Design a protein around this nucleic acid. Structure first.
Ligand SMILES: [Mg+2]
Ligand SMILES: [Mg+2]
Ligand SMILES: [Mg+2]
Ligand SMILES: [Mg+2]
Ligand SMILES: [Mg+2]
Ligand SMILES: [Mg+2]
Ligand SMILES: [Mg+2]
Ligand SMILES: [Mg+2]
Ligand SMILES: [Mg+2]
Ligand SMILES: [Mg+2]
Ligand SMILES: [Mg+2]
Ligand SMILES: [Mg+2]
Ligand SMILES: [Mg+2]
Ligand SMILES: [Mg+2]
Ligand SMILES: [Mg+2]
Ligand SMILES: [Mg+2]
Ligand SMILES: [Mg+2]
Ligand SMILES: [Mg+2]
Ligand SMILES: [Mg+2]
Ligand SMILES: [Mg+2]
Ligand SMILES: [Mg+2]
Ligand SMILES: [Mg+2]
Ligand SMILES: [Mg+2]
Ligand SMILES: [Mg+2]
Ligand SMILES: [Mg+2]
Ligand SMILES: [Mg+2]
Ligand SMILES: [Mg+2]
Ligand SMILES: [Mg+2]
Ligand SMILES: [Mg+2]
Ligand SMILES: [Mg+2]
Ligand SMILES: [Mg+2]
Ligand SMILES: [Mg+2]
Ligand SMILES: [Mg+2]
Ligand SMILES: [Mg+2]
Ligand SMILES: [Mg+2]
Ligand SMILES: [Mg+2]
Ligand SMILES: [Mg+2]
Ligand SMILES: [Mg+2]
Ligand SMILES: [Mg+2]
Ligand SMILES: [Mg+2]
Ligand SMILES: [Mg+2]
Ligand SMILES: [Mg+2]
Ligand SMILES: [Mg+2]
Ligand SMILES: [Mg+2]
Ligand SMILES: [Mg+2]
Ligand SMILES: [Mg+2]
Ligand SMILES: [Mg+2]
Ligand SMILES: [Mg+2]
Ligand SMILES: [Mg+2]
Ligand SMILES: [Mg+2]
Ligand SMILES: [Mg+2]
Ligand SMILES: [Mg+2]
Ligand SMILES: [Mg+2]
Ligand SMILES: [Mg+2]
Ligand SMILES: [Mg+2]
Ligand SMILES: [Mg+2]
Lengths: 107, 148, 140, 190, 97, 95, 166
RNA sequence: UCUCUUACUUUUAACCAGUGAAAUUGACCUGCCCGUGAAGAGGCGGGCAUAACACAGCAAGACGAGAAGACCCUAUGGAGCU
RNA sequence: ACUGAACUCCUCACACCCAAUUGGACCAAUCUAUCACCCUAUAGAAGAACUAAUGUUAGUAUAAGUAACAUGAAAACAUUCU
RNA sequence: CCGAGCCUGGUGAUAGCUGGUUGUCCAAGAUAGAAUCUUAGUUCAACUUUAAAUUUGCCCACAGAACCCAAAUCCCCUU
RNA sequence: GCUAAACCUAGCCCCAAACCCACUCCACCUUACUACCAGACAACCUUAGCCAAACCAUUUACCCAAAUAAAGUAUAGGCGAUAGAAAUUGAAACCUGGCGCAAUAGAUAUAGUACCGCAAGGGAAAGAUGAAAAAUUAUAACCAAGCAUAAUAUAGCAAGGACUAACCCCUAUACCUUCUGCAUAAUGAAUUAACUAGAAAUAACUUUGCAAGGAGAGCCAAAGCUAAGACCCCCGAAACCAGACGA
């Protein structure tokens, strides 16, 4: 709902489009588990397509905890300091890829 | 359950009630279709086709005298004595492709089956049994587990 | 009891979250809120078309006002623009009239000249040289 | 499930104590109409649709189906290599230390099931080690079952038990139709 | 309120104890024990159900027929009332007729 | 109809339909036409023959009878000198 | 129940620096389970709030109500506590910041109506709370002036802008 | 009693202080005229009205509270009497 | 000539406006078997889900600080007076 | 609280009558009449729904469908 | 910030096994719990009714001695609803467990007490520290409704579109139920928290298994048979009958 929800005007960080573009996504922190059927998506993600993801995006940095977790999470930190925590609990590999890619795109 | 009435109140009438109208089975008269069904005599069919099938499979040996006990041990025919089947009757079907030469014992027999068996050289003999007699015959072991 | 619900708190506090800013006992209570929140959401849906229509009417009013400021009226202006093959929607027309009135004056003068060409054509349909701006481009 | 029996029972409006008479009249007062206390609505009342006494969830699958379940279970064990065979249950030391040592060395797993032919021939060493332990369980050939072999990460057989199981299961697969139950004698079946 | 501020104590579940490690054993005894015993006589339970399946009124009539004589007076009264209600319900009330 | 008994907990057949009707193993039912033994003097021969001849039943009441009856009446029976053995089976029926 | 009001005083702020504003000493005090209606004594509470302790207790002394005497003895006890064991120099250099009332753990009794009907009496108990702060009382904010109205109106007229476009 | 009412007193009443209930209550920031509308509008359409907030009185309306209408009809509901 | 819709076109995606009834896909919380271990997964079971029954119980509000209730007077608190 | 007491029990009496009937999402979906101590209901039909086997279904073009005493309709290969 | 909120024990339910109970100091059938005197004072009786049959009148399972099967067959019956066997066959263990509840639940029970009623009889609610209270220590603080903290501002189902801006602007006739049709001035609802209401058979469909056979006796079968799955609510009368209790 609009009136209950806050509002804002459009504004890009630092006017990124004029000069050289910079990925506003700074850091990722994956929290996965060895066991747990929910974390199989993340485990196979880090197996296969985290490597090429990092190769494609050198500007972003990635940390992985890989600890006991009932629900695997992904945390994203941006240049403003904005944080986005998302639950990849029992989630498909391609959908995780789309999610991380749109998080890289998001400001 | 519907909106209102017997439908969702759960008070629909018995089965076969048409709102006071005379039901179908009530207006239809009575006739002697099934009377003494629990006393009518029954016999289970047996085909010469099936008999040749069993002889070829070799579960029942024609070298020895065939009886309904050997049939039930070969699972050629199932029997339900307390369902008032006083035995087994042969069937005209299967007169061809039949070379058994069997010394078959039966309860009921078809003249054509008898002719076929006699042509092939076999023997047919009819023998009447009681209900409990037939029970102890088609299941001898349980009768012997008692000691009578 | 063998099965009892424990998350009632949360599954109602989501509704109360959406109804926090309301007035009276609606924001506090639930059954007074549910009947209202669903109503608010249905109104949020049905408000989209009304937003469209109202903003359209607003652009209409602004364009009519600017035209009368230049001496033109909206129906004639739009007809002449369409005849002269310029599909400027009402949003950008109003924005142009606001932020750069000179271009809007040029557009209004164009529309008036096209009206005059159309009147000359009404006098004589053919048998005359067509208006210079009423001329059209043919694509293929 | 089949051996399960429930024990829940809840008292209905008839079983709960009291609540025979009408508390207040029908039409005089402005309160709502009520026929008795102990209805499901009232506090202290009964359950309308509750667990109705000690139930039974017994049901029997076909003998052939159970045989095939056992067959395929130890088949998949053989395939996933958590299966092992040995000549007999014999060891000189006979202690949980040596047992767990051998397990961890041969890379069996955390949980182990041992099968033996009958209940009497298990030697003292093996019986004592398995009684002291819990994850390395022991059973005769009769007690073998899919549930236990699935729970235990490894299965262990002896050659006599293998022959016994093969005989029984192939007899089920080539089995003859029953007339009277197999508990009684037959010509061929002991 | 229904929720609790503090957590409950953690449920200890020893997944390896006597009956959880022994579970299901001696259930195929009839199949690979040369048919000396059926699993119906193996289970522990009431006498009006040892390898029997049935709904409410079936169970009630069975238990009054079998163990009804040993029953207390109040229990047998409540049970007779139960079978009466269940008879008239299953036979007179409901859809599908 | 009496979907559960108080003595055994089983369905129960109405002996009315047993007296009135007959079932063939195909699922069909037969009956004697009503009014065949009353007021014969005024009825023309064709009419009384239509009344004497047996008739089948449509599937609605066939289902009614099948539901109220038990499986004992639907089983196969091998009687002697039964004129309905010709008919207990079905022949040349598609869809 | 809850009794956080007594704990509010148990806190201890850290030491302050030499070169910093002197902190004003504040304290809390309350009385529990008074036979009086909170709806009644709330008037007294918001009368006494926002003034000096002396003027407050004077108004209470000369107010012909039951709660006034209780409130004034409570305030005197708070004053004595503050001077003895809270490091308050001037006993009269106090003002009320927050004076409020609240419901308490009540009791339920029966009153008899006619025709056999009965009603319930709810004996009312009330808790009373006050916060004292040293230093002079803050001045009441005067009414906003015509110039204030005018400047608000003109700054609103300047803050407004175009809508629903660039 | 009335023409035709009046004056005085006690209670009541209002104010100050103490104690402190019930029936009712979908939410309400609870206006008027005309018209329409499930045929009688505070909530709808067109007009008019409109700083906010109490205390005391009235009973026109809220189809006001109250009591699942007793009148009438229905129920293959009851009961009394003949 | 214009204004004028959930119609139509326009960029992207589409299972996402009917009563009774019927057919389908998911699923909250719980116990159990087995996993996992800042709270989850695969399966079975069921007292398995409440914005409404002049619903039951407990609390708290409106009506309401309203209706209603009470102590003869004076004084030394010994007495006296009406 | 006597057109015949109150309490207990049958008794969870019955009620074609009234009310209520709990998570999310999608889809299809108001339909002639007959009988009934029946018209506040029910059964059949009809309509609707689901899963399957098969093939014609709908629109309809000439011809065709009564003496007595109009708009249209039925049938109907093609398209 | 108060009022409050939260807890986990008591105990209880279902089964199994096992047969069980009583100062023996005084008193207690007269008006019970009262130390002590002349009476002739004794029981053996079909249950009925509600309800179903859509009315109702014959009728309508409720056990009296092995679980299964025969069998819902023989039979009876306003031949209607419905009731309903037997001959015959013939079962395999120790009890210390719970895919039962945890203070509106589970026994009504902290108790048949308080309390109500002449009497028979009806019949409750609640509690929660901590190892130690011969430690009252002590943010456990944070959460229902209700208030104060902190009254009020033209105009309108109280919101939505929005807006620089809370309002002022445009839009919009509360919910459920019932009904041909409700904003309707038709019902119900003060509100919070907890409890509260779809249980089932053949016959079909889906999935396995085997197959002229299937099923761990009994049953079915002209591809059938066995197993599983999913399918059928709650509250409410005036009334009727039997036995006690009351002048
Ligand atoms: Mg209804
Ligand atoms: Mg209806
Ligand atoms: Mg009925
Ligand atoms: Mg609150
Ligand atoms: Mg438009
Ligand atoms: Mg009772
Ligand atoms: Mg009674
Ligand atoms: Mg009742
Ligand atoms: Mg209870
Ligand atoms: Mg006068
Ligand atoms: Mg007054
Ligand atoms: Mg006063
Ligand atoms: Mg009240
Ligand atoms: Mg009007
Ligand atoms: Mg208006
Ligand atoms: Mg208006
Ligand atoms: Mg009026
Ligand atoms: Mg009224
Ligand atoms: Mg009425
Ligand atoms: Mg009628
Ligand atoms: Mg009558
Ligand atoms: Mg009657
Ligand atoms: Mg469209
Ligand atoms: Mg679309
Ligand atoms: Mg509909
Ligand atoms: Mg989940
Ligand atoms: Mg429930
Ligand atoms: Mg309610
Ligand atoms: Mg009322
Ligand atoms: Mg009302
Ligand atoms: Mg008033
Ligand atoms: Mg007064
Ligand atoms: Mg007085
Ligand atoms: Mg009476
Ligand atoms: Mg009386
Ligand atoms: Mg009822
Ligand atoms: Mg649709
Ligand atoms: Mg009706
Ligand atoms: Mg055609
Ligand atoms: Mg009678
Ligand atoms: Mg017998
Ligand atoms: Mg309790
Ligand atoms: Mg209790
Ligand atoms: Mg407006
Ligand atoms: Mg309704
Ligand atoms: Mg009407
Ligand atoms: Mg309708
Ligand atoms: Mg309308
Ligand atoms: Mg109204
Ligand atoms: Mg109104
Ligand atoms: Mg009315
Ligand atoms: Mg009405
Ligand atoms: Mg609730
Ligand atoms: Mg079900
Ligand atoms: Mg009667
Ligand atoms: Mg007297």
């Amino acid at each position: 709902t609009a009136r209950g929800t806050p509002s804002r005007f459009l504004a890009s960080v630092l006017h990124n489009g004029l000069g050289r573009y910079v990925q506003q996504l700074q850091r990722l922190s994956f929290s996965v588990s060895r066991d747990g059927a929910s974390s199989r998506g993340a485990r196979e993600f880090v197996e296969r397509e985290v490597i090429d993801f990092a190769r494609r995006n050198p500007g972003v940095v990635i940390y992985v905890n890989s600890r006991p977790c009932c629900v695997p999470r992904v945390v994203a930190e941006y240049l403003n300091g904005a944080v986005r925590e998302e639950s990849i609990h029992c989630k498909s590999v391609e959908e995780i890829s789309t999610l991380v890619q749109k998080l890289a795109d998001q400001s | 359950r519907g909106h209102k009435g017997e439908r969702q109140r759960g008070t629909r009438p018995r089965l076969g009630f048409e709102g006071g109208q005379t039901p179908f089975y009530i207006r239809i008269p009575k006739y002697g279709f099934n009377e003494g069904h629990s006393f009518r005599r029954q016999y289970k069919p047996l085909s010469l086709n099936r008999l040749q099938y069993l002889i070829d499979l070799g579960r029942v040996d024609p070298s020895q005298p065939i009886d309904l006990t050997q049939l039930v041990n070969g699972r050629g025919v199932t029997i339900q004595p307390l369902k008032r089947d006083y035995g087994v009757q042969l069937v005209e079907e299967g007169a061809d492709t039949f070379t058994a030469k069997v010394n078959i014992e039966v309860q009921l027999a078809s003249e054509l089956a008898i002719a076929a068996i006699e042509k092939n050289g076999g023997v047919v003999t009819t023998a009447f049994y009681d209900p409990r007699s037939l029970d102890i015959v088609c299941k001898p072991v349980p009768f012997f587990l008692r000691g009578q | 009891l063998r099965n009892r619900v424990t998350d009632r708190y949360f599954r109602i506090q989501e509704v109360l979250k959406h109804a926090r800013h309301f007035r009276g006992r609606k924001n506090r209570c639930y059954r007074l809120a549910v009947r209202t929140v669903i109503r608010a959401f249905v109104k949020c849906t049905k408000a989209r078309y009304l937003k469209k229509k109202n903003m359209r009417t607003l652009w209409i009013n602004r364009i009519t006002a600017a035209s009368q400021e230049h001496g033109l009226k909206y129906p004639a202006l739009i007809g002449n623009l369409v005849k002269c093959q310029v599909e400027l929607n009402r949003k950008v027309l109003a924005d142009l009239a606001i932020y750069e009135p000179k271009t809007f004056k040029s557009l209004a003068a164009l529309a008036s000249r096209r009206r005059h060409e159309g009147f000359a054509a009404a006098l004589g349909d053919g048998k005359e040289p067509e208006g210079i701006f009423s001329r059209v481009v043919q694509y293929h | 499930n089949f051996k399960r029996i429930s024990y829940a029972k809840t008292k209905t409006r008839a079983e709960v104590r009291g609540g025979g008479r009408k508390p207040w009249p029908q039409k005089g007062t402005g309160r709502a109409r009520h026929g008795s206390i102990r209805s499901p609505l009232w506090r202290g009342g009964g359950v309308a649709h509750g667990p109705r006494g000690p139930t039974s969830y017994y049901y029997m699958l076909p003998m052939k189906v159970r045989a095939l379940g056992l067959k395929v279970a130890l088949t998949v064990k053989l395939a996933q290599d958590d299966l092992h065979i040995m000549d007999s249950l014999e060891l000189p030391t006979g202690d949980p230390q040596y047992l767990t040592e051998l397990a961890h060395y041969r890379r069996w797993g955390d949980s182990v099931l041992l099968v033996d032919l009958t209940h009497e021939e298990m030697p003292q060493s093996i019986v004592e080690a398995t009684s002291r332990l819990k994850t390395f369980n022991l059973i005769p050939a009769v007690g073998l079952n899919v549930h236990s072999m699935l729970k235990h990460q490894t299965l262990v057989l002896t050659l006599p038990t293998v022959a016994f199981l093969e005989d029984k299961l192939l007899w089920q697969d080539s089995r003859y139709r029953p007339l009277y139950p197999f508990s009684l004698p037959y010509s061929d079946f002991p | 309120i229904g929720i609790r501020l503090t957590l409950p104590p953690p449920k200890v579940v020893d997944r390896w104890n006597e009956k959880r490690a022994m579970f299901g054993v001696y259930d195929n005894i009839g199949i690979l024990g040369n048919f000396e015993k059926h699993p119906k006589e193996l289970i522990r339970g009431p006498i009006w159900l040892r390898g029997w399946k049935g709904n409410e009124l079936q169970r009630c009539i069975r238990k009054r027929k079998m163990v009804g004589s040993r029953m207390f007076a109040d229990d047998l009264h409540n049970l007779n009332k139960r079978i009466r209600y269940l008879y008239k319900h299953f036979n007179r009330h409901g859809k599908f007729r | 109809l009496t979907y559960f008994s108080a003595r055994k907990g089983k369905r129960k057949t109405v002996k009315a339909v047993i007296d009135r009707f007959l079932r063939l193993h195909c699922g069909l039912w037969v009956r004697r036409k009503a009014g065949y033994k009353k007021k014969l003097w005024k009825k023309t021969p064709a009419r009384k023959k239509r009344l004497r001849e047996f008739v089948f039943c449509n599937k609605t009441q066939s289902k009614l009878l099948d539901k109220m009856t038990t499986s004992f009446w639907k089983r196969r029976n091998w009687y002697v000198d039964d004129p309905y053995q010709k008919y207990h089976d079905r022949t040349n029926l598609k869809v | 129940i809850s009794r956080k009001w007594e704990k509010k005083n148990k806190i201890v702020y850290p030491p302050q620096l030499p070169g910093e504003p002197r902190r004003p000493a504040e304290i809390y005090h309350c009385r529990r389970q008074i036979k009086y209606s909170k709806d009644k004594m709330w008037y007294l509470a918001k009368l006494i709030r926002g003034m000096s302790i002396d003027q407050a207790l004077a108004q209470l002394e000369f107010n012909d109500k039951k709660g006034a005497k209780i409130i004034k003895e409570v305030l005197l006890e708070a004053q004595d506590m503050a001077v003895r064991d809270h490091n308050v120099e001037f006993r009269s250099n106090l003002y009320i910041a927050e004076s409020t009332s609240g419901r308490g753990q009540c009791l339920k009794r029966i009153r008899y109506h006619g025709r056999g009907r009965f009603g319930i009496m709810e004996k009312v108990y009330c808790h009373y709370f006050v916060k004292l702060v040293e230093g002079p009382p803050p001045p009441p904010e005067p009414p906003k002036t015509a110039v204030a109205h005018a400047k608000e109106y003109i700054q609103q007229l300047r803050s407004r802008t175009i809508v629903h476009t660039l």
